[PDB]
Amino acid sequence: LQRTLVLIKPDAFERSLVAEIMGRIEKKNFKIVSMKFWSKAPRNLIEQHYKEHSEQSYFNDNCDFMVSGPIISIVYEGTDAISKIRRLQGNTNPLASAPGTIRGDLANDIRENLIHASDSEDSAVDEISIWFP
Amino acid sequence: LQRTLVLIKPDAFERSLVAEIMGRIEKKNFKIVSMKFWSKAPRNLIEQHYKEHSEQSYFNDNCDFMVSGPIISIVYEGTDAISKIRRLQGNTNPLASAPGTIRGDLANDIRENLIHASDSEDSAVDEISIWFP
Amino acid sequence: LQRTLVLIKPDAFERSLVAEIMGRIEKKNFKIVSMKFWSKAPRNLIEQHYKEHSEQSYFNDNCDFMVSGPIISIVYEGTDAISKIRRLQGNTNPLASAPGTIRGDLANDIRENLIHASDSEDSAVDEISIWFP
Amino acid sequence: LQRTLVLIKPDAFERSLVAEIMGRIEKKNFKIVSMKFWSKAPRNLIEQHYKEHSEQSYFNDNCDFMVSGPIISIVYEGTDAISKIRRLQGNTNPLASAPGTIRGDLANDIRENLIHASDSEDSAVDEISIWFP
Amino acid sequence: LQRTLVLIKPDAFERSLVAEIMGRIEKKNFKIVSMKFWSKAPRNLIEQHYKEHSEQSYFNDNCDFMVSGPIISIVYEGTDAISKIRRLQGNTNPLASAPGTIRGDLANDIRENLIHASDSEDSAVDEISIWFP
Amino acid sequence: LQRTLVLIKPDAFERSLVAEIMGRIEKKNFKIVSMKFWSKAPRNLIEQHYKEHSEQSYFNDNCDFMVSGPIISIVYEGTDAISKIRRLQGNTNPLASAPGTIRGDLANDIRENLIHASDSEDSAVDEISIWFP
Ligand SMILES: Cc1cn([C@H]2C[C@H](O)[C@@H](COP(=O)(O)OP(=O)(O)O)O2)c(=O)[nH]c1=O
Ligand SMILES: Cc1cn([C@H]2C[C@H](O)[C@@H](COP(=O)(O)OP(=O)(O)O)O2)c(=O)[nH]c1=O
Ligand SMILES: Cc1cn([C@H]2C[C@H](O)[C@@H](COP(=O)(O)OP(=O)(O)O)O2)c(=O)[nH]c1=O
Ligand SMILES: Cc1cn([C@H]2C[C@H](O)[C@@H](COP(=O)(O)OP(=O)(O)O)O2)c(=O)[nH]c1=O
Ligand SMILES: Cc1cn([C@H]2C[C@H](O)[C@@H](COP(=O)(O)OP(=O)(O)O)O2)c(=O)[nH]c1=O
Ligand SMILES: Cc1cn([C@H]2C[C@H](O)[C@@H](COP(=O)(O)OP(=O)(O)O)O2)c(=O)[nH]c1=O
Ligand SMILES: [Mg+2]
Ligand SMILES: [Mg+2]
Ligand SMILES: [Mg+2]
Ligand SMILES: [Mg+2]
Ligand SMILES: [Mg+2]
Ligand SMILES: [Mg+2]
């Protein structure tokens, strides 16, 4: 049994895909254990969340997008939740994400890509600590 | 123009219908203003939410049900949101709830009825203050 | 509390709507008690099922349709299941069947109308005994 | 037996509901006879389509909306198609449109209401001639 | 043209996914040729069905699960039905089953995995003989 | 930003999957820029469209199928639309097309395979010129 941190990104709100995304996770039998809605996430939590990318060319553009509308931060629990939800999520690059995945079916951009999911046990603990201190 | 208070009830979690219900409201173009997840709502909060029912024979049984699993409380905003969401919700009684409504399609019990929605301007003000003080 | 008899009619098979119809009843939380698949129902069984219509001008044409492809017969159980499933079914006449109902959303003909459901306690008893002696 | 004229309005394109709307009509078993895509309909065509509303206070605002994005115009054929598609469409007013209908489930505005459908035999003849001369 | 044997497992009933699963197969254009509902499958047919696993550590636990609620046994027919339905089914291991498959989208356990499908021409004949003697 | 040519094939009309297919493309955020409905495509445009296959064993059978009912020709626009829509489409061979793709989920035949999509930048320009001269 693991916990992972998911963000529903502002493009999901703009495109009315919030329930579509949450539903794919719900249907796989993962359970919500914490959830917060942010009308606009503070820039500082976004920069902390994406700290590994802070020196990347896309960092500022990505943070700008992440504060451009609401987000939901959710902690999901289930056996091997981290890797399983990453598989459901799909590749960042829309030339790579597979049909059947969230990004493969619904996203068409490397930045506006609908959903964040923790990529490891340690990053899940880190991200949970940011959004649910 | 109006804000209303919605609860996603514990049966929605048991039956994995959280996204289904939220999605029906989302597709109608209502905006989330606030959202809280409760692993278990305090009984007192439930009793206050249903204070107008305190003399009804079903009061305690309904409170027991409402603390039997998680709840999500949501404030939705939209023109005439209160009455519109009530119509989407459907009648309490499963003999009457209309196909096409949330309860009409998904609920089969007078108590385990998936969703609460404020019934008026006066009660919306009260309920929002209870769940989001 | 009540048991009702449902038939999934041959048009549902032709139009690949079997799961769609069954799913609407399933989502309403009704329990399957018995289920039979018929590659072709015997005409006599159909005539007995519709015996109250034997003097109607449509009787033979309706029997012809009912033996034109497969049928699934199902006994569903639930509180007040008979009237509830009738309301989900929708009116026979495509001028009247309400959007949100099975027929309202999916049927466009008075005869090729996808689904049978018992109309009363008395007829449910009779029909269950016909299909599941 | 009857032919009716449907417009998929610019809000359906903005909100990515084109297939959702078309699918509801398709599932009802109506046949497409003609279909045109308009990147932007000429304003004059819109004014002619709504000529009976020319004296209403909303006339110009509604025309502005109708040329604000793409439209698909469709001729559908079926027995009593005109009234049946009107019932699927739902009432103009979001205080009244019934859950289960296109507008009841998906529209939340009197003007941005997703879909036009001819209201009578007389108007269907006129509208088909406007969109498909 | 081949026939394959599918079981809808008790977790599908518990989670109200019976029609969801049958629908995925229906949408791929496979046809039902036999179907039986079992309120509780006899233990002996379950042990016969899974005879290859009789000496495995998981055999008893799996049989226990398979008699823990209802099942449906279905024979499906279509060109290369066996391999095609196995592909739709997805890997037993939820760390392996791909998004888009039945198990990839809906199952989260190696045992409670929603659906059985025959794995070969000879096992299909064997399994059909068990459930439809 | 690229444009690609899609045909919705006659089997989609027969099986009432037109909106299902268009919806998968719509949900991926591709936009319609041209669309025509053909009650029956002229044989000559079909032969031109499939000119690369003119000497193949299956050419005539395929053309026969392509004029056996209506089609829709659609031009879709978006970043890397050509390759992305080809990935959504799935392999021609139903022993190869992956669950999650249009053909993987919905097609069960190498010829009656629901959808055409251009396979390259140059073939997209060629095909657009045929259907939208
Ligand atoms: C790699 C990459 C990421 N991003 C943005 C979108 C990503 O969701 C976010 C974090 O990158 P990353 O951790 O690689 O992606 P993922 O979201 O799949 O875990 O940074 C870009 O805008 N451009 C890029 O080239
Ligand atoms: C009327 C009624 C309500 N209840 C419970 C379920 C209702 O959602 C809750 C409040 O009743 P009420 O406000 O009448 O219903 P609604 O939720 O449709 O506004 O009380 C019962 O348990 N039994 C009953 O007979
Ligand atoms: C009234 C009517 C029924 N029928 C057929 C279709 C009906 O499902 C069947 C039984 O009629 P009825 O019991 O009136 O309808 P329902 O199925 O809604 O209970 O007879 C016709 O073919 N033509 C008709 O005019
Ligand atoms: C009545 C009304 C209509 N309209 C617009 C939207 C309507 O779709 C269009 C034509 O009105 P009407 O023919 O009354 O509605 P319907 O589309 O339901 O047949 O005019 C307004 O903008 N405001 C209004 O108050
Ligand atoms: C391999 C395996 C199977 N099982 C159960 C669930 C499987 O559906 C059933 C039969 O195993 P198997 O034939 O390997 O799986 P499949 O269902 O994918 O054809 O045994 C376990 O409980 N644990 C295990 O490790
Ligand atoms: C290869 C092949 C194609 N066809 C038909 C169906 C194909 O959609 C059409 C064109 O072939 P092709 O361009 O290979 O397929 P795709 O549609 O995946 O781009 O020819 C057959 O009927 N039999 C065959 O063996
Ligand atoms: Mg990452
Ligand atoms: Mg109330
Ligand atoms: Mg009757
Ligand atoms: Mg009008
Ligand atoms: Mg096996
Ligand atoms: Mg090709």
Side-chain angles (χ1 to χ4, degrees):
Chain A
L1 229 61
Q2 285 187 325
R3 293 181 180 198
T4 195
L5 183 287
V6 159
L7 305 178
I8 304 304
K9 299 181 172 189
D11 54 337
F13 283 87
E14 183 64 21
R15 296 174 62 205
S16 300
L17 288 172
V18 176
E20 172 68 34
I21 295 156
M22 290 178 67
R24 288 173 179 233
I25 299 169
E26 189 171 13
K27 286 172 183 183
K28 178 75 161 178
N29 216 198
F30 292 108
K31 304 297 168 194
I32 300 170
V33 297
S34 304
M35 185 169 60
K36 288 190 201 163
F37 168 83
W38 306 78
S39 59
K40 183 175 190 303
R43 177 59 164 250
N44 64 333
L45 302 187
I46 296 293
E47 294 190 4
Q48 295 172 22
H49 179 88
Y50 283 118
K51 69 179 150 275
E52 79 193 88
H53 304 273
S54 64
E55 313 310 305
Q56 299 279 244
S57 57
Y58 55 80
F59 182 71
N60 286 345
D61 280 337
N62 185 66
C63 292
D64 286 348
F65 161 65
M66 288 293 296
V67 300
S68 74
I71 67 169
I72 302 168
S73 56
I74 311 164
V75 179
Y76 282 111
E77 189 176 68
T79 301
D80 285 316
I82 297 163
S83 70
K84 290 171 181 172
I85 289 170
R86 286 281 277 181
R87 209 135 70 93
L88 249 27
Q89 175 185 220
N91 201 290
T92 329
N93 191 318
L95 291 178
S97 60
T101 64
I102 295 159
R103 286 165 170 179
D105 290 340
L106 310 172
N108 202 31
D109 188 72
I110 193 156
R111 175 161 41 253
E112 299 182 358
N113 60 36
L114 295 167
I115 175 170
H116 169 83
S118 312
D119 71 358
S120 74
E121 287 186 306
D122 300 314
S123 58
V125 174
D126 282 352
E127 293 166 6
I128 293 173
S129 79
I130 295 167
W131 297 102
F132 299 97
Chain B
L1 175 139
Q2 283 187 336
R3 288 179 175 187
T4 193
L5 184 284
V6 162
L7 306 178
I8 306 300
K9 297 186 170 180
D11 52 338
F13 294 84
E14 182 62 27
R15 296 175 62 210
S16 300
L17 290 172
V18 174
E20 171 69 35
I21 297 158
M22 289 181 69
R24 288 164 178 244
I25 299 170
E26 192 181 2
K27 289 172 182 186
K28 184 72 168 172
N29 220 19
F30 288 109
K31 176 171 169 166
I32 295 170
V33 168
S34 313
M35 187 162 54
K36 288 170 170 183
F37 171 87
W38 305 77
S39 61
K40 295 274 165 303
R43 184 181 289 271
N44 187 259
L45 196 78
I46 300 306
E47 294 183 355
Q48 290 303 300
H49 178 88
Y50 288 115
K51 63 183 170 281
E52 292 305 307
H53 304 263
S54 67
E55 311 310 304
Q56 297 307 288
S57 83
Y58 58 76
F59 178 77
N60 197 257
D61 282 346
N62 184 61
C63 293
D64 285 353
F65 161 63
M66 290 289 288
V67 300
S68 72
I71 283 174
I72 290 162
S73 57
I74 312 170
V75 180
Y76 284 109
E77 191 174 60
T79 298
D80 291 312
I82 297 167
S83 68
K84 289 169 177 179
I85 289 174
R86 286 282 279 178
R87 289 191 62 239
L88 290 179
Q89 166 187 227
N91 194 256
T92 332
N93 196 314
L95 284 177
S97 53
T101 66
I102 294 163
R103 287 165 172 180
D105 289 340
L106 311 171
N108 206 18
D109 189 69
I110 185 101
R111 173 174 310 130
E112 302 183 354
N113 63 33
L114 297 167
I115 173 165
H116 171 86
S118 308
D119 69 359
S120 74
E121 289 190 318
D122 297 2
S123 64
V125 168
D126 290 349
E127 297 169 0
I128 294 175
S129 70
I130 284 170
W131 292 89
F132 299 92
Chain C
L1 175 139
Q2 283 187 336
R3 288 179 175 187
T4 193
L5 184 284
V6 162
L7 306 178
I8 306 300
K9 297 186 170 180
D11 52 338
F13 294 84
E14 182 62 27
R15 296 175 62 210
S16 300
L17 290 172
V18 174
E20 171 69 35
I21 297 158
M22 289 181 69
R24 288 164 178 244
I25 299 170
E26 192 181 2
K27 289 172 182 186
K28 184 72 168 172
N29 220 19
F30 288 109
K31 176 171 169 166
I32 295 170
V33 168
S34 313
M35 187 162 54
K36 288 170 170 183
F37 171 87
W38 305 77
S39 61
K40 295 274 165 303
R43 184 181 289 271
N44 187 259
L45 196 78
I46 300 306
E47 294 183 355
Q48 290 303 300
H49 178 88
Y50 288 115
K51 63 183 170 281
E52 292 305 307
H53 304 263
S54 67
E55 311 310 304
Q56 297 307 288
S57 83
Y58 58 76
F59 178 77
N60 197 257
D61 282 346
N62 184 61
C63 293
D64 285 353
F65 161 63
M66 290 289 288
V67 300
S68 72
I71 283 174
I72 290 162
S73 57
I74 312 170
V75 180
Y76 284 109
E77 191 174 60
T79 298
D80 291 312
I82 297 167
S83 68
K84 289 169 177 179
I85 289 174
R86 286 282 279 178
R87 289 191 62 239
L88 290 179
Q89 166 187 227
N91 194 256
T92 332
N93 196 314
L95 284 177
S97 53
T101 66
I102 294 163
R103 287 165 172 180
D105 289 340
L106 311 171
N108 206 18
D109 189 69
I110 185 101
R111 173 174 310 130
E112 302 183 354
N113 63 33
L114 297 167
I115 173 165
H116 171 86
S118 308
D119 69 359
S120 74
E121 289 190 318
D122 297 2
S123 64
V125 168
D126 290 349
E127 297 169 0
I128 294 175
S129 70
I130 284 170
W131 292 89
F132 299 92
Chain D
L1 175 139
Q2 283 187 336
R3 288 179 175 187
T4 193
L5 184 284
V6 162
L7 306 178
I8 306 300
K9 297 186 170 180
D11 52 338
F13 294 84
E14 182 62 27
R15 296 175 62 210
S16 300
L17 290 172
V18 174
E20 171 69 35
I21 297 158
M22 289 181 69
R24 288 164 178 244
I25 299 170
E26 192 181 2
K27 289 172 182 186
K28 184 72 168 172
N29 220 19
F30 288 109
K31 176 171 169 166
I32 295 170
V33 168
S34 313
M35 187 162 54
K36 288 170 170 183
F37 171 87
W38 305 77
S39 61
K40 295 274 165 303
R43 184 181 289 271
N44 187 259
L45 196 78
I46 300 306
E47 294 183 355
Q48 290 303 300
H49 178 88
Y50 288 115
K51 63 183 170 281
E52 292 305 307
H53 304 263
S54 67
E55 311 310 304
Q56 297 307 288
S57 83
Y58 58 76
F59 178 77
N60 197 257
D61 282 346
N62 184 61
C63 293
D64 285 353
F65 161 63
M66 290 289 288
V67 300
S68 72
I71 283 174
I72 290 162
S73 57
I74 312 170
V75 180
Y76 284 109
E77 191 174 60
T79 298
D80 291 312
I82 297 167
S83 68
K84 289 169 177 179
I85 289 174
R86 286 282 279 178
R87 289 191 62 239
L88 290 179
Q89 166 187 227
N91 194 256
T92 332
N93 196 314
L95 284 177
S97 53
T101 66
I102 294 163
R103 287 165 172 180
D105 289 340
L106 311 171
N108 206 18
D109 189 69
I110 185 101
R111 173 174 310 130
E112 302 183 354
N113 63 33
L114 297 167
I115 173 165
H116 171 86
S118 308
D119 69 359
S120 74
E121 289 190 318
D122 297 2
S123 64
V125 168
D126 290 349
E127 297 169 0
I128 294 175
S129 70
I130 284 170
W131 292 89
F132 299 92
Chain E
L1 229 61
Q2 285 187 325
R3 293 181 180 198
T4 195
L5 183 287
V6 159
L7 305 178
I8 304 304
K9 299 181 172 189
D11 54 337
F13 283 87
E14 183 64 21
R15 296 174 62 205
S16 300
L17 288 172
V18 176
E20 172 68 34
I21 295 156
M22 290 178 67
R24 288 173 179 233
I25 299 169
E26 189 171 13
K27 286 172 183 183
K28 178 75 161 178
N29 216 198
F30 292 108
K31 304 297 168 194
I32 300 170
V33 297
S34 304
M35 185 169 60
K36 288 190 201 163
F37 168 83
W38 306 78
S39 59
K40 183 175 190 303
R43 177 59 164 250
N44 64 333
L45 302 187
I46 296 293
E47 294 190 4
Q48 295 172 22
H49 179 88
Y50 283 118
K51 69 179 150 275
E52 79 193 88
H53 304 273
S54 64
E55 313 310 305
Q56 299 279 244
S57 57
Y58 55 80
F59 182 71
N60 286 345
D61 280 337
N62 185 66
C63 292
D64 286 348
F65 161 65
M66 288 293 296
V67 300
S68 74
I71 67 169
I72 302 168
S73 56
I74 311 164
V75 179
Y76 282 111
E77 189 176 68
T79 301
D80 285 316
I82 297 163
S83 70
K84 290 171 181 172
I85 289 170
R86 286 281 277 181
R87 209 135 70 93
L88 249 27
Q89 175 185 220
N91 201 290
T92 329
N93 191 318
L95 291 178
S97 60
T101 64
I102 295 159
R103 286 165 170 179
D105 290 340
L106 310 172
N108 202 31
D109 188 72
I110 193 156
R111 175 161 41 253
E112 299 182 358
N113 60 36
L114 295 167
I115 175 170
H116 169 83
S118 312
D119 71 358
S120 74
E121 287 186 306
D122 300 314
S123 58
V125 174
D126 282 352
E127 293 166 6
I128 293 173
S129 79
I130 295 167
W131 297 102
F132 299 97
Chain F
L1 229 61
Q2 285 187 325
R3 293 181 180 198
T4 195
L5 183 287
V6 159
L7 305 178
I8 304 304
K9 299 181 172 189
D11 54 337
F13 283 87
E14 183 64 21
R15 296 174 62 205
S16 300
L17 288 172
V18 176
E20 172 68 34
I21 295 156
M22 290 178 67
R24 288 173 179 233
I25 299 169
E26 189 171 13
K27 286 172 183 183
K28 178 75 161 178
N29 216 198
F30 291 108
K31 304 297 168 194
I32 300 170
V33 297
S34 304
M35 185 169 60
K36 288 190 201 163
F37 168 83
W38 306 78
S39 59
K40 183 175 190 303
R43 177 59 164 250
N44 64 333
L45 302 187
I46 296 293
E47 294 190 4
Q48 295 172 22
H49 179 88
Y50 283 118
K51 69 179 150 275
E52 79 193 88
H53 304 273
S54 64
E55 313 310 305
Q56 299 279 244
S57 57
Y58 55 80
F59 182 71
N60 286 345
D61 280 337
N62 185 66
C63 292
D64 286 348
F65 161 65
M66 289 293 296
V67 300
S68 74
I71 67 169
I72 302 168
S73 56
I74 311 164
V75 179
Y76 281 111
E77 189 176 68
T79 301
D80 285 316
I82 297 163
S83 70
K84 290 171 181 172
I85 289 170
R86 286 281 277 181
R87 209 135 70 93
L88 249 27
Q89 175 185 220
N91 201 290
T92 329
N93 191 318
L95 291 178
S97 60
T101 64
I102 295 159
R103 286 165 170 179
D105 290 340
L106 310 172
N108 202 31
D109 188 72
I110 193 156
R111 175 161 41 253
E112 299 182 358
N113 60 36
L114 295 167
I115 175 170
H116 169 83
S118 312
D119 71 358
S120 74
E121 287 186 306
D122 300 314
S123 58
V125 174
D126 282 352
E127 293 166 6
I128 293 173
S129 79
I130 295 167
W131 297 102
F132 299 97

